[PDB]
Amino acid sequence: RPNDFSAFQCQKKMMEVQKKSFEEKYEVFMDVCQNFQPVFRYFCMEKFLDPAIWFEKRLAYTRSVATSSIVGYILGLGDRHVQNILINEQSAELVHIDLGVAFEQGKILPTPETVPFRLTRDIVDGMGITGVEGVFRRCCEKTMEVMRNSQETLLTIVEVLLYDPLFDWTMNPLKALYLQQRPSFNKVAERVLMRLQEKLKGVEEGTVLSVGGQVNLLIQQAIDPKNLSRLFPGWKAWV
Amino acid sequence: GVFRRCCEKTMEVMRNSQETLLTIVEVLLYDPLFDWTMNPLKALYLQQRPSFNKVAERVLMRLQEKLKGVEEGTVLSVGGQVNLLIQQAIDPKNLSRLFPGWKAWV
Amino acid sequence: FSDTQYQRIENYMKSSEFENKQALLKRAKERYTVKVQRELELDELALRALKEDRKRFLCKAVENYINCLLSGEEHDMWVFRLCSLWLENSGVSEVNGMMKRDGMKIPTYKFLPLMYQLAA
Numbered sequence: 001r002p003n004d005f006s007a008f009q010c011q012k013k014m015m016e017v018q019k020k021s022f023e024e025k026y027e028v029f030m031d032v033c034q035n036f037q038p039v040f041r042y043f044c045m046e047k048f049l050d051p052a053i054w055f056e057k058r059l060a061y062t063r064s065v066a067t068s069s070i071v072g073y074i075l076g077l078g079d080r081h082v083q084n085i086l087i088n089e090q091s092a093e094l095v096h097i098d099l100g101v102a103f104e105q106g107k108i109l110p111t112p113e114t115v116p117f118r119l120t121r122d123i124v125d126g127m128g129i130t131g132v133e134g135v136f137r138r139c140c141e142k143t144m145e146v147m148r149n150s151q152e153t154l155l156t157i158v159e160v161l162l163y164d165p166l167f168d169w170t171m172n173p174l175k176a177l178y179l180q181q182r183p184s185f186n187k188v189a190e191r192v193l194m195r196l197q198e199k200l201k202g203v204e205e206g207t208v209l210s211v212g213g214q215v216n217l218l219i220q221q222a223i224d225p226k227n228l229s230r231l232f233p234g235w236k237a238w239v
Numbered sequence: 240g241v242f243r244r245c246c247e248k249t250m251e252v253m254r255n256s257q258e259t260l261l262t263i264v265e266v267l268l269y270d271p272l273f274d275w276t277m278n279p280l281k282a283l284y285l286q287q288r289p290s291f292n293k294v295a296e297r298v299l300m301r302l303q304e305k306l307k308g309v310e311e312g313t314v315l316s317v318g319g320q321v322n323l324l325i326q327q328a329i330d331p332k333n334l335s336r337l338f339p340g341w342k343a344w345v
Numbered sequence: 346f347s348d349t350q351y352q353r354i355e356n357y358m359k360s361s362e363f364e365n366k367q368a369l370l371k372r373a374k375e376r377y378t379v380k381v382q383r384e385l386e387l388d389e390l391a392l393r394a395l396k397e398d399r400k401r402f403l404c405k406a407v408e409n410y411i412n413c414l415l416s417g418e419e420h421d422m423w424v425f426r427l428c429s430l431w432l433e434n435s436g437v438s439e440v441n442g443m444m445k446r447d448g449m450k451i452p453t454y455k456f457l458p459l460m461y462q463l464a465a
């Protein structure tokens with residue numbers, strides 16, 4: 001897309017509106033998204049010329065995205081910017097690195113992360129013409145069903161994790177400032193454990209939801225432009 | 240028979256109207272003239288032998304859990320909740336601990 | 346739906362996560378000063394937006410509850426909610442004005458079931 005906005009232009013426009021109203025942020029984000037169209041669908045096309053291999057790699061990519069999204073939401077993974085996610089060139093599967101921020105500590109950040117996972121326009125465009133519908137939603141539902149069926153074991157494992165003395169998982173002002181720079185412990189652990197329990201039982205806003213309903217809510221929250229417009233520019237929600 | 244089925248029907252109606260019931264109890268609990276909390280004098284008078292906002296919020300959340308069928312952190316159906324309540328009510332172990340004025344043997 | 350949105354905002358404002366986020370800034374404030382004042386300035390904007398959104402949702406919910414009460418008798422019990430929103434937000438001028446203008450048109454017998462709670 002040579003005639004669209006450059007990534008530098010989008011980044012500059014996004015930083016300019018940072019110290020402005022939320023309406024201005026939303027309108028600037030919409031204008032940027034108008035002149036910045038996703039191109040990730042070309043990743044599998046240019047690498048896998050054979051249609052069968054192309055279809056297999058695209059299916060593997062979509063399944064990997066669904067599984068990673070559900071698991072990261074369960075663990076509250078944050079800081080999922082473009083440089084923290086890698087794609088395998090041979091297998092088209094996603095690998096998540098830089099796992100320092102987890103258990104919804106990113107919501108404590110100065111510019112809070114309003115999305116459970118990264119489901120931006122490029123990520124959905126990489127899934128094909130159907131988008132989130134089809135393979136992605138069904139795989140998300142399957143992963144959430146498995147997570148719900150194993151809530152006791154998962155809760156026990158996270159309990160063992162959170163009380164590890166050497167596990168520095170809580171957010172501190174120095175870490176928060178380093179994450180977003182521009183030119184009682186028992187109480188917190190119990191709160192995080194109870195939030196994880198609510199997630200594993202399907203309770204989101206005090207109402208019990210089915211697996212499909214919870215998946216729908218997560219997808220709607222992740223793809224909502226209003227949430228994406230509020231995010232830190234380093235997250236690159238337009239990409 | 241009749242008792243368990245009627246209990247299930249009443250619990251179903253209670254669950255279907257949890258929002259209205261919760262609103263009504265919210266209106267009740269914040270009535271300034273409603274002295275519903277327990278105090279030591281009332282407790283002693285009840286059994287004699289020869290922050291308010293925190294308590295209100297706790298009671299409201301407990302009522303919400305009851306109306307949603309959550310008892311011990313696990314979601315129960317109407318039948319399961321009714322079974323649990325009947326088992327708790329008829330348990331001799333619970334009845335043996337009660338105050339003699341309650342007359343659990345009667 | 347407006348009441349649901351308002352209740353969600355209220356719960357978030359009284360959530361323990363909100364308290365943790367607020368207390369983190371108070372701990373951090375105690376180069377360095379520039380980012381500290383940046384944070385203590387942005388939190389004010391966020392809180393103001395949240396409060397204005399809550400006020401809009403509350404006003405819409407109260408007005409629509411009044412309109413529903415004026416338009417029929419099937420949902421009379423919801424007057425409880427109309428009182429619960431009104432009594433807990435007596436300081437809000439818009440709610441009082443709406444109760445004075447259109448709340449007066451509501452038939453008085455619908456207020457009978459909670460006549461105690463109003464009288465207190």
Ligand SMILES: [Mg+2]
Nearest residue numbers: 083084097098
């Ligand atoms: Mg990195």
